[PDB]
Design an enzyme around this catalytic site. Structure first.
Site, PDB file in Angstrom:
ATOM      1  N   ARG A  20      -5.253  13.652   6.250  1.00 25.50           N
ATOM      2  CA  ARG A  20      -4.333  12.633   5.679  1.00 25.50           C
ATOM      3  C   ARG A  20      -4.140  11.454   6.638  1.00 25.50           C
ATOM      4  NH1 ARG A  20      -1.485  17.081   7.181  1.00 25.50           N
ATOM      5  NH2 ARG A  20      -0.285  16.796   9.118  1.00 25.50           N
ATOM      6  N   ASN A  21      -4.444  11.682   7.912  1.00 24.89           N
ATOM      7  CA  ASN A  21      -4.329  10.645   8.934  1.00 24.89           C
ATOM      8  C   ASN A  21      -5.674  10.012   9.294  1.00 24.89           C
ATOM      9  OD1 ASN A  21      -1.556  10.321   9.476  1.00 24.89           O
ATOM     10  ND2 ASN A  21      -1.487  12.217  10.689  1.00 24.89           N
ATOM     11  N   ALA A  59      10.347   5.962   5.200  1.00 23.88           N
ATOM     12  CA  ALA A  59      11.720   5.761   5.634  1.00 23.88           C
ATOM     13  C   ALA A  59      11.753   4.730   6.757  1.00 23.88           C
ATOM     14  CB  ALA A  59      12.336   7.072   6.087  1.00 23.88           C
ATOM     15  N   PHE A  60      10.673   4.681   7.533  1.00 18.78           N
ATOM     16  CA  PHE A  60      10.594   3.787   8.683  1.00 18.78           C
ATOM     17  C   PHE A  60       9.786   2.518   8.404  1.00 18.78           C
ATOM     18  N   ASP A  98      -2.798   7.224  12.635  1.00 22.81           N
ATOM     19  CA  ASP A  98      -1.615   8.100  12.743  1.00 22.81           C
ATOM     20  C   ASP A  98      -0.510   7.439  11.941  1.00 22.81           C
ATOM     21  OD1 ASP A  98       0.283  10.009  13.344  1.00 22.81           O
ATOM     22  OD2 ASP A  98       0.282   9.694  15.507  1.00 22.81           O
ATOM     23  N   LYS A 115       6.677  -0.031   6.182  1.00 25.45           N
ATOM     24  CA  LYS A 115       6.178  -0.560   4.919  1.00 25.45           C
ATOM     25  C   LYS A 115       4.804  -1.158   5.172  1.00 25.45           C
ATOM     26  CE  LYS A 115       8.231  -2.698   0.828  1.00 25.45           C
ATOM     27  NZ  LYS A 115       9.282  -3.624   0.314  1.00 25.45           N
ATOM     28  N   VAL A 116       3.795  -0.696   4.440  1.00 23.90           N
ATOM     29  CA  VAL A 116       2.435  -1.153   4.686  1.00 23.90           C
ATOM     30  C   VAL A 116       1.895  -2.004   3.536  1.00 23.90           C
ATOM     31  CG1 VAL A 116       0.050  -0.473   5.171  1.00 23.90           C
ATOM     32  CG2 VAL A 116       1.964   0.812   6.136  1.00 23.90           C
ATOM     33  N   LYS A 148       1.571  -3.506   8.772  1.00 21.82           N
ATOM     34  CA  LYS A 148       2.744  -2.641   8.794  1.00 21.82           C
ATOM     35  C   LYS A 148       3.925  -3.407   9.350  1.00 21.82           C
ATOM     36  CE  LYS A 148       3.459   0.636  11.931  1.00 21.82           C
ATOM     37  NZ  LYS A 148       3.251   1.948  12.617  1.00 21.82           N
ATOM     38  N   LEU A 194       0.834  -1.190   0.000  1.00 19.18           N
ATOM     39  CA  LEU A 194       0.000   0.000   0.000  1.00 19.18           C
ATOM     40  C   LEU A 194       0.873   1.245   0.000  1.00 19.18           C
ATOM     41  CD1 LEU A 194      -2.957  -1.031   2.317  1.00 19.18           C
ATOM     42  CD2 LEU A 194      -2.850  -0.852  -0.203  1.00 19.18           C
ATOM     43  N   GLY A 195       1.993   1.164   0.705  1.00 16.63           N
ATOM     44  CA  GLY A 195       2.849   2.313   0.871  1.00 16.63           C
ATOM     45  C   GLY A 195       4.167   1.960   1.517  1.00 16.63           C
ATOM     46  N   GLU A 196       5.083   2.919   1.497  1.00 16.99           N
ATOM     47  CA  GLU A 196       6.368   2.760   2.145  1.00 16.99           C
ATOM     48  C   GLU A 196       6.811   4.099   2.699  1.00 16.99           C
ATOM     49  OE1 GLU A 196      10.712   0.653   1.526  1.00 16.99           O
ATOM     50  OE2 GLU A 196       9.436   0.941  -0.238  1.00 16.99           O
ATOM     51  N   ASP A 204      -1.088  14.940  15.567  1.00 18.45           N
ATOM     52  CA  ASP A 204      -1.004  15.084  14.116  1.00 18.45           C
ATOM     53  C   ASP A 204      -2.350  14.774  13.478  1.00 18.45           C
ATOM     54  OD1 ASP A 204       0.103  15.607  11.587  1.00 18.45           O
ATOM     55  OD2 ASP A 204       1.005  13.625  11.384  1.00 18.45           O
TER      56      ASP A 204
HETATM   57  N1  LIG Z   1       0.470   1.812  10.980  1.00 14.83           N
HETATM   58  C1  LIG Z   1      -0.404   1.765  10.249  1.00 14.83           C
HETATM   59  C2  LIG Z   1      -1.493   1.680   9.307  1.00 14.83           C
HETATM   60  C3  LIG Z   1      -1.305   2.053   7.985  1.00 14.83           C
HETATM   61  C4  LIG Z   1      -2.338   1.927   7.074  1.00 14.83           C
HETATM   62  C5  LIG Z   1      -3.576   1.436   7.465  1.00 14.83           C
HETATM   63  C6  LIG Z   1      -4.668   1.262   6.487  1.00 14.83           C
HETATM   64  C7  LIG Z   1      -5.773   0.452   6.547  1.00 14.83           C
HETATM   65  N2  LIG Z   1      -6.516   0.511   5.396  1.00 14.83           N
HETATM   66  C8  LIG Z   1      -5.868   1.369   4.615  1.00 14.83           C
HETATM   67  C9  LIG Z   1      -6.127   1.824   3.299  1.00 14.83           C
HETATM   68  C10 LIG Z   1      -5.289   2.725   2.752  1.00 14.83           C
HETATM   69  C11 LIG Z   1      -4.197   3.206   3.501  1.00 14.83           C
HETATM   70  N3  LIG Z   1      -3.473   4.278   3.013  1.00 14.83           N
HETATM   71  C12 LIG Z   1      -2.700   5.135   3.900  1.00 14.83           C
HETATM   72  C13 LIG Z   1      -1.258   4.699   4.009  1.00 14.83           C
HETATM   73  C14 LIG Z   1      -0.686   3.898   3.034  1.00 14.83           C
HETATM   74  C15 LIG Z   1       0.636   3.498   3.133  1.00 14.83           C
HETATM   75  C16 LIG Z   1       1.401   3.889   4.211  1.00 14.83           C
HETATM   76  C17 LIG Z   1       0.842   4.684   5.188  1.00 14.83           C
HETATM   77  C18 LIG Z   1      -0.479   5.086   5.087  1.00 14.83           C
HETATM   78  N4  LIG Z   1      -3.853   2.787   4.744  1.00 14.83           N
HETATM   79  N5  LIG Z   1      -4.738   1.863   5.246  1.00 14.83           N
HETATM   80  C19 LIG Z   1      -3.761   1.079   8.795  1.00 14.83           C
HETATM   81  C20 LIG Z   1      -2.733   1.197   9.711  1.00 14.83           C
END
Ligand SMILES: N#Cc1ccc(-c2cnc3ccc(NCc4ccccc4)nn23)cc1
Ligand SMILES: [Cl-]
Length: 271
Positions: A143-144, A22-23, A157, A25-26, A46, A18-20, A139
């Site tokens: 976006r959070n 510096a700290f 967060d 990886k999701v 994560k 889903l994302g990455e 924060d």
């Molecule tokens: N710790 C933690 C945590 C992170 C994500 C989620 C989460 C759960 N469903 C979704 C959908 C989409 C989604 N993008 C936001 C995102 C994507 C990549 C990295 C950071 C944020 N993050 N996300 C839950 C918990």
């Protein structure tokens, strides 16, 4: 002490990044033997990449915290995964992603007033809960927040993507911070209330950045000077009044989040 729920690594089936950061990886993943209903369910996972010794200790305290920091409008934490190499946390998956992106994508199919209020009220609901737990977020920003089905909204967060939203030393979301947080790094339920006012402004501007026109230095000057964001075009005056109540210069003069929730919830129910 607090017993963190443990999820077997083999019960996690990774599906997609889903994302990455510096700290962190999701990942999106399937998790077996978790749901009381289904055989498998979607989760967000994560994994910390090569964490410090403090980072490890930090991870465990956070896991213990999240174990009980549980509410309908707080992103659901299910537990920790595997046995430390690496460190993995498991959360629910929110299929419509972060609220800021979501807002920007529904701006000039658009969000009506009732939808914006429902969004705002859910966030305030999560914040009522956080304040009841003496938890200061520091924060809060769209976006959070994450969005699920039927405009379900929850607070998280998250550890890059919105680097512009932070000022250089650790990163501070100055555009969301009140004067006493900028100056003294005093963070309280009252500075979170200030942040929520800015969240309201974000929602009613379809996710625009506060003070987009200004530099970070100018924002510091702006906030310190007691200047406030102007009422968004589609923001009803009472909602703006709530925003101003969040932006009182003296923290103890700010509306409390229970009052904010009570107002927004009523308005959303009425519209
Ligand atoms: N710790 C933690 C945590 C992170 C994500 C989620 C989460 C759960 N469903 C979704 C959908 C989409 C989604 N993008 C936001 C995102 C994507 C990549 C990295 C950071 C944020 N993050 N996300 C839950 C918990
Ligand atoms: Cl896997």
């Amino acid at each position: 002490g607090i017993h963190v729920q443990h999820i077997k690594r083999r019960d996690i089936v990774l599906k997609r990044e889903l994302g990455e950061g510096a700290f962190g990886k999701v990942f999106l993943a399937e998790c077996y033997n978790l749901s009381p209903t289904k055989d498998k369910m979607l989760v967000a996972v994560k994994a910390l990449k090569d964490p410090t010794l403090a980072a490890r200790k930090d991870f465990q305290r956070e896991a213990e915290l999240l174990t009980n920091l549980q509410h309908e409008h707080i992103v659901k934490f299910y537990g920790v995964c595997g046995d430390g190499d690496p460190l993995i946390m498991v959360f629910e998956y929110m299929k419509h992603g972060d609220l800021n992106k979501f807002l920007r994508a529904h701006g000039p199919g658009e969000l009506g007033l009732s939808q914006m209020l429902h969004i705002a009220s859910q966030i305030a609901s999560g914040m009522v809960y956080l304040a009841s737990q003496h938890f200061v977020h520091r924060d809060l920003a769209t976006r959070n927040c994450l969005v699920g089905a039927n405009l379900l909204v929850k607070i998280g967060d998250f550890g890059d993507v919105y680097s512009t939203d932070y000022y250089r030393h650790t990163m501070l979301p100055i555009r969301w911070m009140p004067p006493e947080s900028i100056m003294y790094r005093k963070f309280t339920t009252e500075s979170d209330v200030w942040s929520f006012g800015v969240i309201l402004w974000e929602i009613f501007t379809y996710g625009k950045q506060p003070w987009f026109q200004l530099s970070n230095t100018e924002v510091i000057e702006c906030i310190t000077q007691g200047r406030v964001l102007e009422r968004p075009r589609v923001c009803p005056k009472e909602v703006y009044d709530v925003m101003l109540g969040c932006w009182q210069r003296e923290p103890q003069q700010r509306l409390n989040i229970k009052e904010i929730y009570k107002i927004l919830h009523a308005l959303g129910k009425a519209t």
